[PDB]
Amino acid sequence: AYPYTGSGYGGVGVPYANDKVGQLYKVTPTSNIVDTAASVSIFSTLVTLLAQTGLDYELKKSG
């Protein structure tokens, strides 16, 4: 029911990390806060407000 990913002799044989290829720490598919708030049709007024104030800039940071 809850198989533990193991390439060889670990257990069931599910490929490692429960994905097609046995690799981990894959590149992130997500984007910055400004980008995800800009991609959606709503939050458009926030993208304008963060554009005006310059808090666009602090949300681009990776903290």
């Binding site: 193991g6 390439s7 060889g8 002799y9 670990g10 490929p15 490692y16 990390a17 290829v21 046995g22 690799q23 981990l24 720490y25």
Partner: protein
Amino acid sequence: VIINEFDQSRLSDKLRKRASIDLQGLKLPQSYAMAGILKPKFVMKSSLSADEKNTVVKACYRQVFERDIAKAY
């Protein structure tokens, strides 16, 4: 195998180009290199069996330290 190997080619001599300006480059015939026992190269990948991770890691200690520091001490 003889009449297979007489068919094929000269192989390609292995060139060795150095990015640095000072170093000198030297070629080797690929015939000279493939005599002996090939020296295995240990590769680490995210998805591998725990034997293959342990052999690569134990190979790292032998490379950096000149000896195994896990078996001893």
